[PDB]
Write a protein that binds this ligand. Structure first.
Ligand SMILES: [Cl-]
Ligand SMILES: [Fe+3]
Ligand SMILES: [Fe+3]
Ligand SMILES: [Fe+3]
Ligand SMILES: [Fe+3]
Ligand SMILES: [Fe+3]
Ligand SMILES: [Fe+3]
Lengths: 311, 309, 309
């Protein structure tokens, strides 16, 4: 019984968060999203053309009608790579606190363990020698508390979820599910090329999750990043903000001095892409307790729906 | 009016236009109208490229080009975040007192840099709109054999490019964006120029540093390297050519700093590059200072090299 | 005579050729003369690609390729700046006494590394021309099961590549530049190879570190990751293949270090990559040391993978 293929709302998000897909091994998430799409697309207002193929590695690209804008959400999560003697290296920049519950699978089967900081080096405490190169991930632990949702990997399974929501009604546009976002990228680059060249699209939205801040508060609305480590074109961000205000959808304006997203890869590509990071903010980013307010999920989905239509 | 300035007056003007990384448009707009005013008086009329697929970049194509010169329009500055706190745009010098400027929905803006709570702020008359970019207060001084002003880097380069244009016969001049902050304009210019014109030689027209090795007024700097390393054979070719000249120049060898030349190097296109420009004291401060004789050499060397490469 | 060398003598010669990042030309020149003398003795004759549009890179195409191997010609070293001071080319080891060689307009250069005033420089005869590159003094040694020489990294890769060519039927072998220093050649190789031959699989033929996890003489290393992370399914495929073999290999898992693989990964083309090379002791020192049995595993595994991938 493959019931997950029809999950919805928070149950779908829970599923998405549960799927072990660290950077460099997004394949299982790609597989799920791909079947989910083929199982549900017929219920969408508009049927997209599905691109998944070798020249896209494990990426997925959806093209709805005649697109003008492309949205990018990353399937990869942070995590850790098992090295020698059950030692660990990070995949991306995860939080590393003793006791974090980590899961994975190797040739000897499932793996469960705890993160230990022995001799000032990180390692995986488990009942056996784990195969080298085995990736481990935060143990799924999906919680629904008050107006909140606490789970590992809201970044960016929430983004993936939002994208899929978007797909329910999206008429014109592109939804791209990317790889390696958490760990240096290298998928968006080819996506940047192909989308631009094939569809002549050069506007994007980065569907990812940001931080809750003294300046960006939980439940106060989806965040439009006017900049982070990188800086998009002010006129593009302005234009977005403008459209956002044609709405009663609550949003907050993020101005950070750090952090990067797929947007960076777009910016640095040899293709003249505009980009803007829009997404719900979370507390405890990159921890197994990523927390997001249900209202911001709601705002996020709403702004994406509106932006994708008017951009 | 200004659409007709010249010499140091034009420099002053270029230096006054608020164009930090990511918001180069106002400078683009000016440069573009300025070109359209003056091109007719130039020795050769280039084909002007500006538009959607170039974002806010400008590319001038003169004759049958063999070499492309790149000068960045964007300047360092600050981005007002929350409660008038600031983040850098590029890597500007930060010292309590620096005058900054800008405009929001509530009009013009003028502020001092306050380093309250070891965190950088914009002390100003009210709550500034978020994301509002602030720039060093335009203050143009002609002092001895020197020009002191915010943003010689790289408004001197843009200026130099515009001089070049007066007589350039064969070549490309590209005005770039985001150089001070990560780049991402040159990448597409690297592609388009190479693919369209088959040009793969470049000169990075930008400002470098005054050093015990590169002295003010001892001539334009030909960078043999920085953070990055261009092809020796290319650099040598340039130095050979420069030595065919009585134009003074100095050989810079740095272990740090990057430019538009880096973006080219790293592009999927077989670009040769070389950073060439005047040296300045107090880079990235509001007091950027260059020697008039180094400007002169810069212009001269650029003219020559563009004709000979 | 060198144009015919073999075995370790070919490696000695490769290691002796002064070719730091940004100036790989001499090695290119040697590799090309060499390929043109010996390709005839090979099982299959490749198509040679070296041009203006490849800068100083070389690309060999055997038959109908599915996979591309990349080996970097450039070596670490140092660039002489002002007053015989120095900057690093790549990340070389810095120890007083290190023997350095070069050549400027005043002939040959031989010197040592001096740490004067917390600052690095070259102690030599005379003032060295600015921007002159210097290199570890060749010192090829054969000692037990080991080879000790500067620049095993990546002359051993270059060497391995040349061996592979002796038998390779279908595949691409590319000799790269600037790998030790920010790269910028692979970017265009990635485009060109992918677009022209529809090849999107690679093996990075470079040398890694001897480690508590990767031991000398215990076989060639298949890197599951380093600073970067390749596609797990690709790496798995490689390991699977290696296991069909009696060739010894070790599974490397590092949290740092980059290769030409990174450039491929980050390119606008869907490259799979995997770093496979012998491990070395004392990397980036004049005493790089590798075990012959690992060189033999390396050659062996490349030959096999190129045939099976
Ligand atoms: Cl962000
Ligand atoms: Fe994310
Ligand atoms: Fe993240
Ligand atoms: Fe500059
Ligand atoms: Fe600068
Ligand atoms: Fe190497
Ligand atoms: Fe190396």
């Amino acid at each position: 019984h493959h019931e997950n293929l029809y999950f919805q709302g928070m149950q779908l998000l829970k599923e998405l968060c549960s799927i072990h897909a660290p950077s460099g091994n997004e394949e299982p998430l790609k597989d799920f999203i791909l079947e989910y799409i083929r199982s549900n697309a017929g219920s969408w207002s508009y049927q997209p053309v599905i691109y998944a193929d070798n020249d896209l590695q494990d990426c997925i690209v959806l093209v709805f009608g005649n697109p003008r804008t492309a949205v990018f959400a990353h399937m990869d999560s942070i995590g850790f790579t098992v090295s020698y003697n059950n030692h660990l290296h990070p995949i991306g920049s995860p939080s590393a606190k003793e006791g974090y519950r980590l899961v994975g699978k190797d040739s000897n089967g499932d793996i469960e363990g705890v993160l230990k900081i022995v001799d000032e080096e990180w390692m995986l405490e488990t009942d056996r020698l784990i195969d080298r190169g085995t990736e481990v991930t935060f143990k799924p632990d999906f919680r629904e508390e008050g107006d909140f949702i606490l789970t590992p990997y809201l970044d960016d399974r929430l983004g993936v979820w939002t994208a899929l929501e978007l797909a329910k009604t999206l008429e014109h546009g592109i939804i791209a599910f990317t790889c390696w976002e958490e760990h240096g990228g290298g998928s968006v680059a080819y996506l940047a090329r192909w989308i631009y060249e094939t569809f002549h699209v050069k506007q994007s939205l980065i569907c990812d999750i940001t931080w809750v801040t003294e300046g960006v508060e939980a439940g106060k609305g989806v965040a439009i990043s006017m900049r982070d480590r990188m800086i998009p074109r002010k006129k593009y961000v302005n234009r977005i903000i403008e459209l956002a205000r044609q709405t009663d959808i609550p949003f907050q304006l993020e101005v950070e001095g750090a952090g990067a997203s797929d947007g960076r890869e777009l910016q640095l590509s040899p293709y003249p892409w505009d980009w803007c990071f829009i997404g719900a903010p979370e507390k405890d980013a990159h921890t197994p307790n990523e927390c997001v307010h249900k209202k911001d999920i709601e705002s996020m989905v709403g702004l994406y729906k509106y932006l994708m239509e008017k951009l």
